[model samples]
Target: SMQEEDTFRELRIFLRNVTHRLAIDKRFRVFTKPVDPDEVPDYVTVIKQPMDLSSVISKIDLHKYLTVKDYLRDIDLICSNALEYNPDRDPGDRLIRHRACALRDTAYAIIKEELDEDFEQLCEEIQESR
Candidate 1:
């Protein structure tokens, strides 16, 4: 891997703003950290590209992303990985799945508009603890 300075310098502000917006939303609270392999022995085996906000956030300061597109993929991975590993068939997956769906619904909005989508929980009941 190669290293460079003044790298993604423009993307730096943009990413943090999007990341920060998600971080502030209570619905996205669970995405702040990754699910532990120790906690769920099957997770690491099932999902190949495990992702989380803090991991991406940490990567940001470390200049891990080379382009704006590279950075966005990490953000997208969080939602995809969550739902992929934790399927919707089980009742236990409800909260996690709902949050992933919420992220899926809102991700484009943030990426395109930098505005928090009006993601109201109309039909489904959601628990923040997930």
Candidate 2:
């Protein structure tokens, strides 16, 4: 039950970051339609809106038993690799890595918050066990 909660929260955070990074493109169709810059309110404006959470999650090919740590690592690894290979060092590629690292860093904070004083030693033990 605890791990389930962790995974859900982790996915939520990851999804939020992913959604934030997605560019509005009709071809990709991975996000809601773009809002006209002029139409944006003076008080606030949302440029990029994410696709539905369930829809996005369903598209990700992940196993049911995967933990937050696993998902976070996988995301980081993929983005890191992408960042490494991107010759242009374009903003889009940088954004992807930034979002992925944000999720990965947040996962650590979330786990620390969940485990409290037990966090560090447990991490060490988990590493040792591996």
Candidate 3:
């Protein structure tokens, strides 16, 4: 659990840094030569948004599991917002898209694994409490 926790924490921090860096520094441009910005490749906004997850995170006050869930929710919210703007729209900001997918997948796996374990633990706890 410590290892898992540490990994998640480190990953979350890394992603947070990327998100912040990408926001303020327009120079942190993504999707170079082959992918034109005007073209709106696939998922450009993924990398464009303020990536203010760190701000939201700092405000959280709850269980580690709940905090992680909140983090995932934040990610899902952005993903949904992007799709809502245009579902069929696959705007390709190659680098940004790549980063988004990578972050999404990492968060998904970490949340899923932890939740699965939590469910099993909950079952055991409930049965014993009875």
Candidate 4:
């Protein structure tokens, strides 16, 4: 399935970047699989915002953060910040990409989620125009 392949690829890329970022912080070098969803509620919440992931590449000081949750909060903040330029519209499109970077950013985020294979493929294909 093309859709399944794309989605898995996306998740693979996302997790790979996250893991890579975590690996470089020389302060406390530790690598773990994607943090459990419940463990990182902020990421889940920020995920709802719908924005492009600029790639989480910054080196964070792990020792300064008290817990993994705190680190997650930082990640969420970065994710939300990435959408700072996203617009304020539902199902936004690139037609307005230049009018405002915010909307563009948000639209990109939403579209990326749509790339998930099993979520909206059937409904979206049905809604397509002739």
lDDT of each: 0.69, 0.43, 0.45, 0.38
Q: In TM-score terms, which candidate is top?
A: 1
User: After aligning candidate 2 to the native by TM-score, how far in Å is the CA of 107 from where it should be?
Assistant: 1.3
Candidate 1 lDDT score at position 51: 86
1-130 per-residue lDDT for model 4 (tens digits): 5654454344445444444543444421212223346765665565544322222332222122222233344445433443443345544423233323433343345445533544334433433421
Find the candidate with the highest lDDT and give its number. 1
- Name the runs in model 1 displaced over 4 angstroms: 1-7, 115-130
Provide the lowest-lDDT 10-residue window in model 3.
Answer: 26-35
* TM-score pick, better of 1 and 4: 1
User: What is the TM-score of each predicted model, taking all chains together?
Assistant: 0.71, 0.34, 0.37, 0.25
Rank by TM-score (best first): 1, 3, 2, 4
> What would you estimate as the lDDT of candidate 3?
0.45
Residue pairs clashing, model 2: none
Q: Report clash pairs, candidate 3.
A: 40-91, 40-92, 41-91, 41-92, 42-90, 42-91, 42-92, 43-91
**Could you report the Cα RMSD, in angstroms, for every candidate shown?**
11.9, 11.8, 10.1, 15.2
Encode model 1's per-residue lDDT on 1-130: one tens digit a residue. Answer: 1122332454566678778878878999889888787887887888887888888888988966645556767877887788777777777687888887787667667666652222212101121221
Tens-digit per-residue lDDT, 12-50, candidate 2: 455445533432322223123332346545312321232
RMSD of 3: 10.1
